[PDB]
UniProtKB/Swiss-Prot annotation:
Catalyzes the O-methylation, and thereby the inactivation, of catecholamine neurotransmitters and catechol hormones. Also shortens the biological half-lives of certain neuroactive drugs, like L-DOPA, alpha-methyl DOPA and isoproterenol. Binds 1 Mg(2+) ion per subunit. One of its GO terms (biological process) is response to cytokine. The modification Phosphoserine is found at S214. This is Catechol O-methyltransferase. The chain holds residues 46 to 259 of 264 of the full protein. It comes from the Eukaryota. It comes from Rattus norvegicus.
Amino acid sequence: DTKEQRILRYVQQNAKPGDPQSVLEAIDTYCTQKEWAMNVGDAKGQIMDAVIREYSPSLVLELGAYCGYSAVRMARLLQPGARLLTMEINPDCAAITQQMLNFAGLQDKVTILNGASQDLIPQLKKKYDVDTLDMVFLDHWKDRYLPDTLLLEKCGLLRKGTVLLADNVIVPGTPDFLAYVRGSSSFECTHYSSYLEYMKVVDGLEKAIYQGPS
Ligand SMILES: Cc1nnc(C2CC2)n1-c1ccccc1
Ligand code: NA
């Protein structure tokens, strides 16, 4: 038995089928009052919402999924015909995420790819007919933020205006990724700070808008 499974069982008893908002609230309640989980929080959640709404991405790529919270949080805001592609290496988190999306009524919008992102990313063009992404959400293994950004560029998956949004850049922290995008002229960066009231600790998200190479 895992924490993610217990979050699933809790949503199923306390949220309403097909209602993405009630699913998100059930998760926020469980991960505030009962068992903490990093991906969830609403300082973070309202920044994810504002970015999605400002940029209206047609194709989002999510690196990392735990119980589906981020994917539900994003998929529920996508326009009709917009699609979310989620890569998760842990097959158990992938199955929970899938069931969480099924519960939320959102499975028609999301495609879960199970695998290491470094191996899935070079395949997006040939296997999934992906040309370019409008948005990328980085919430997976902190060591992969930078190397995977480089792979996205190597494969031409970013275009002028593609929005990278990086979670947990301070806690547990992704300093090499922050150094790369803030220091590169390919990226225009905005940092969103987020006080974790319950930990007495400062964390943040990074927004980097790809400029192209030039
Ligand atoms: C990559 C990359 N791009 N710019 C930088 C720093 C600002 C100069 N780094 C870097 C250097 C050393 C360790 C980790 C990341
Ligand atoms: Na920069």
